[PDB]
Amino acid sequence: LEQSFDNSSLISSVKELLLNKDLIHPSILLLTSHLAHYKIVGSIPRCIAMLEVFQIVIKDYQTPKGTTLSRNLTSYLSHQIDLLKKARPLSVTMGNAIRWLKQEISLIDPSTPDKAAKKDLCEKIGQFAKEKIELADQLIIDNASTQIEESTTIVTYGSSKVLTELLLHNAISLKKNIKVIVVDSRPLFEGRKMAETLRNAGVNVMYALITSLDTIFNMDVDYVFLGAHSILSNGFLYSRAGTAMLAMSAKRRNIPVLVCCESLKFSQRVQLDSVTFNELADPNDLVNKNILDGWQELPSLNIVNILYDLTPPEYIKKVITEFGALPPSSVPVILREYKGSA
Amino acid sequence: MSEFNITETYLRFLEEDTEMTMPIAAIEALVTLLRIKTPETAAEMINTIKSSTEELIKSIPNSVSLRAGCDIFMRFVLRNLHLYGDWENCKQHLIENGQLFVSRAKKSRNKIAEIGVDFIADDDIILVHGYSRAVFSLLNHAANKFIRFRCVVTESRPSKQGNQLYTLLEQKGIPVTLIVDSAVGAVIDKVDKVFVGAEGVAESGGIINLVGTYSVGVLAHNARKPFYVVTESHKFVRMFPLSSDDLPMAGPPLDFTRRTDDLEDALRGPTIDYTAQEYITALITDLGVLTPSAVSEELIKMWYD
Structure with a gap:
């Protein structure tokens, strides 16, 4: 209590979100239980793991009835983020990937028939993992x-x-x-x-x-x-x-x-x-x-x-x-x- | 009948051997002064030797090792004047003590090595500075011990001494290079241990030898390499400066006069620097390994009254 650093609220140790408000992907629950329980990661392993599980969660779209793909996906993916936020606080390789990802969600136009959505998100996030990670590491x-x-x-x-x-x-x-x-x-x-x-x-x-x-x-x-x-x-x-x-x-x-x-x-x-x-x-x-x-x-x-x-x-x-x-x-x-x- | 002042006794036997150095030559001359000139009275003996020490300092002032020898001779005649033999035996007792320095201080240099060989460990690149022959007296017994090391010798501008070591222990058979004296900072990141040799020790532990041992000392501190100094026990001197500037050579270390036609321009700055007690970390004498606060106590006890 002399420095009171142990009560620093930059991490919250609350667990076990039972709420079924959103469709939480089971693969992302595997990823959060793979991060927070037994830490197998650095930073760019967390970046590649997060990026190639967001790969799967955009490949499994399941869009709702009246909502366009440009108007749901950022809130859905932010609720996907919130489970990792509960699991382990985020890197900058977390953050500078997810804000780029939201900026690339933002420039989509309401004419995609949810078939070229793969061809401009899967291929583009693969180009991200290529360019800003892997060939950068080759350099x-x-x-x-x-x-x-x-x-x-x-x-x-x-x-x-x-x-x-x-x-x-x-x-x-x-x-x-x-x-x-x-x-x-x-x-x-x-x-x-x-x-x-x-x-x-x-x-x-x-x-x-x-x-x-x-x-x-x-x-x-x-x-x-x-x-x-x-x-x-x-x-x-x-x-x-x-x-x-x-x-x-x-x-x-x-x-x-x-x-x-x-x-x-x-x-x-x-x-x-x-x-x-x-x-x-x-x-x-x-x-x-x-x-x-x-x-x-x-x-x-x-x-x-x-x-x-x-x-x-x-x-x-x-x-x-x-x-x-x-x-x-x-x-x-x-x-x-x-x-x-x- | 010699008069022992300048060269009728002193400078003669400096040509007898180029292995004896200045202060023990001064000790030998001052003991052979009263070894013969002892006119059966305790008064004029001390007047004679004090006059002789002051004229011998008056001969060469800029060789402060001479002051160290000529003042530990005064400490010798003071403590041998002590034990109070009523001067009846001391006319014989002091002179039969006498030559115990030339039987003692002459054979001190291998006694240096017998305690300083266990510093240079296996595969230590060594930096020495200037022709300090006690360092070579350590290094000779180190190489005779068959221990593996390497040496680096600096220049000694303008006093030429750095060229002597490379023609001294090369023929003993040690891998040695000769660095230039300005290149210390680019090599002292690699040098394991650095040795120097003093021409004097102040009242706190100081190196009053050569042009730039303060520079190599402050390079040793900001490389955090240990800075040892090999000396021996006839090098204590009362002179305790406070700056990095000692007694002058003939004027200040910063001349700004005019060269007349073609006179010499190299020796225009100082030639004998000073090192504070922080930069040295262990010194070697006849008295064992000696931390600088211990050399401060040893030079603080035999000089008070």
Whole structure:
């Protein structure tokens, strides 16, 4: 109660909406129970999953009697959004996809016989997942592969989103020597998902933990890469928690820090303090007769966890996006010149 | 009958060996002063040695190692003047103590190595600055220990000393390069440990040796690489500056005069800088490894009264 941060209402832990007011798609109930119960995702996996379940929910139209397709679908899809809003708070890859999707719903005209609706929404959202995600990531690979010399190391963090393919490309498709160090954190052990895939493909993975973060950097080490959840308007990064400690340790021990991001993921909003806009994530996960049971019913005890916190832009040497490399203080110029306009 | 002042005793044996340095040469000259000139009275002995120390400082002022030797000699004759032998034995007792420095301080340099070899660990790229021969006395025993390392030697403009190390431990058989002195900031991100050698230690821990050890120190701090300094125990001096500017050479470090026709223009700024106690992190003497607040206490206790 001294800082009162545990009563931050940016997430609501209410569950079990039983209301049959709308036709909630059973696939989207599978998607929400797949997100919120056992988190299998990063950010662009959530974006591709949300996008290819909205694919199915527009393919299964079921239009009402007197309402045109241009006058129902945004409210229907917003009530589809509300279940994910209950499940897990949204990324910017959520938001900059759904507002684009609503803008593309808006420019349809009341003459579609609900047969070309597929041909201008399914194909167009496939062009979105092609353009603003996948070939953009292909440009990320082809832009960041020239900035890695042979026989070096890489320290990623957590589950990567795009640069798993970068490490696989520079490991196998370009055959230059590389020694990836993957480090992750309690409780979402999502660096192991990178470690299984990278070592299954046959690259020198050396897993670690973030508590032992000192002894990684005392080896021969350079080129810390970082997956991003969003990049703010100032230059502050925003990603899975525990990123910023190895960011400040990496800048402290004068070895460079990079962020592989794409122009879909830049955000309009602004913050500079870490615990301001943030997600509380289910404090029963930090236990696994257990070690302790019942932080409740014991007065004066609490268990907190944080998913998201900010590296200051002094630490990131280079944000790379599909247009090119850039200093992190110069992200509003791609907020204004390229995001949305491309 | 010599007079021990300038070159009738002192500068002769500097040509005997180019391994002995300036302060222990000063110690040897000052002990051989009263080893012979001892006119059976405690009064004029101290007047003679104080006059000799001040004229020897008057000979070469800009070589502050000389001041360190000529003042620890005064500490030697003060503590050996203590124990109060009524001067009856001390005419023999002090002179039979006497040559214990040239039997002691001459063999201090391998005693440096016997405690400083266990700093340079396996595969450490090392940065040294200037011909500080105690650093090479450590590095010689390090390479004789058969431990694996690499060395990088800076320039020593304008005092030429950086060219000597590359013709010193190359022939010992160590992989070594010679960086230029301005290129420190582009390489000190890669250098594991950096050694220097002092020509003096102030009352807080300071490096009063050469042109730019403050520059390599502040590069070491903003690379967060450990900044060690190898010295020995005849290098303590009372001179405790407060700026980055010491006693002058002949004028200020910022000249603005006019070159007349073709006179020399390189040595126009300073030549002996100063390092604060923050930038050094451990110094090596005969007294063990020594944190700079410990060298401050060690130079604060034997100089008060």
